[PDB]
Enzyme design. Structure first.
Site, PDB file in Angstrom:
ATOM      1  N   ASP A  35      14.731 -48.601 -49.589  1.00 33.10           N
ATOM      2  CA  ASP A  35      14.659 -48.519 -48.145  1.00 33.10           C
ATOM      3  C   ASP A  35      13.219 -48.435 -47.628  1.00 33.10           C
ATOM      4  OD1 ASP A  35      15.110 -48.043 -45.513  1.00 33.10           O
ATOM      5  OD2 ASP A  35      15.945 -46.006 -45.771  1.00 33.10           O
ATOM      6  N   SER A 199       5.692 -59.284 -34.255  1.00 32.69           N
ATOM      7  CA  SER A 199       6.086 -60.686 -34.323  1.00 32.69           C
ATOM      8  C   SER A 199       5.510 -61.405 -33.114  1.00 32.69           C
ATOM      9  CB  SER A 199       7.613 -60.819 -34.375  1.00 32.69           C
ATOM     10  OG  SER A 199       8.041 -62.166 -34.204  1.00 32.69           O
TER      11      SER A 199
END
Length: 330
Positions: A35, A199
């Site tokens: 994770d 992004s």
């Protein structure tokens, strides 16, 4: 040194991925959920409330000659999906894919919430976010990667997650046969403890690319892709019959649909998520309503590039002094 381990979907939907991890002496092999959105290595164990274990493989410290109680140390964690676990702490030898860390904090669960109990295929979590998020008290502990870093050939690990197929976690090297083209690197903020990056935008299907900054985290421990409501609405508007359902808890779509791809930007580069990756199947057995793989982050408080996004790429987690993220097509 280096390590290389295969990671395997736990079910037909790629709801999560498990990776074998050797703990203790003799080795006890547990299948852990790697994770990059948390920083605790915790396991089902001989100390876990009996009623809360249902099929998991447990770590038994008393059978490990290298296990030592970390006196006084406790932990307690809650995840974004509402699940949780807590317990005490041992140090022991932990190996992943041939890579060995001695003195690793292995957090032994006394309690786990129902979600963990109900998932017989996950024996625990191995956190790979930044050690500042580790919950051990009163002495915070380091992640496996943090402990291994100095010994690694290169201070990196890579995530190469499969679509309906096994993939690979590598430590300490970049496998240049595992991706196509170039790797595009992008800046990371560690201020929230996550692999947080921005992004450069998105496209829906064959549509034009929208340049827009989307701050989010690279999180292998989250199944789906969670983005701003504007973005998610623009995507599902291209699917006839798709709608957001409060009763189900997100966007659903007719199982008869062909889903469009979703592209996200990494600098000037583009990663394309095929439409099939965004299908998470019937909401309930036999239903013709299917659950979407792209969902709104509104009210999460953060955007999450979960497995839906990451499995479309070869992803480099660069733990150099100034950390960065790299993305390549594959």
């Amino acid at each position: 040194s280096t390590g290389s381990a295969t990671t395997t979907p736990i079910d037909s939907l790629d709801d999560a991925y498990i990776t074998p991890v050797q703990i203790g002496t003799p080795a006890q092999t547990l299948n852990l959920d790697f994770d990059t959105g948390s920083s605790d290595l915790w396991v089902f164990s001989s100390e876990t409330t009996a009623s809360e274990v249902d099929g998991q493989t447990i770590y038994t410290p008393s059978k490990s000659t290298t296990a030592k109680l970390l006196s006084g140390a406790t932990w307690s964690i809650s995840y974004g999906d509402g699940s949780s676990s807590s317990g005490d702490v041992y140090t022991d030898t932990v190996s992943v894919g041939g890579l060995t860390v001695t003195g690793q904090a292995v957090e032994s669960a006394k309690k786990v919430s129902s979600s963990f109990t109900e998932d017989s295929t996950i024996d625990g979590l191995l956190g790979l976010a930044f050690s500042t998020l580790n919950t051990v008290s009163p002495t915070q502990q380091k992640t496996f990667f943090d402990n291994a870093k100095a010994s690694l050939d290169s201070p990196v690990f890579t995530a190469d997650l499969g679509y309906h197929a096994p993939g690979t976690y590598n430590f300490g090297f970049i496998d240049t046969t595992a991706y196509t083209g170039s790797i595009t690197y992008t800046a990371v903020s560690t201020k929230q403890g996550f692999w947080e990056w921005t992004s450069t935008g998105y496209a829906v299907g064959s549509g034009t690319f929208k340049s827009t900054s989307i701050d989010g985290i690279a999180d292998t421990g989250t199944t789906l892709l969670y983005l701003p409501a504007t973005v998610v609405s623009a995507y599902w508007a291209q699917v006839s019959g798709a709608k957001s359902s409060s009763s189900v808890g997100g966007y659903v779509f007719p199982c008869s649909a062909t889903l469009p791809s979703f592209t996200f930007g990494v600098g000037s580069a583009r990663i394309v998520i095929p439409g099939d990756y965004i299908d998470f199947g019937p909401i309930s057995t036999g239903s013709s309503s299917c659950f979407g793989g792209i969902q709104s982050s509104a009210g999460i408080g953060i955007n999450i590039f979960g497995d839906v996004a990451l499995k479309a790429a070869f992803v480099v987690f660069n733990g150099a002094t100034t950390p960065t993220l790299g993305f390549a097509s594959k």
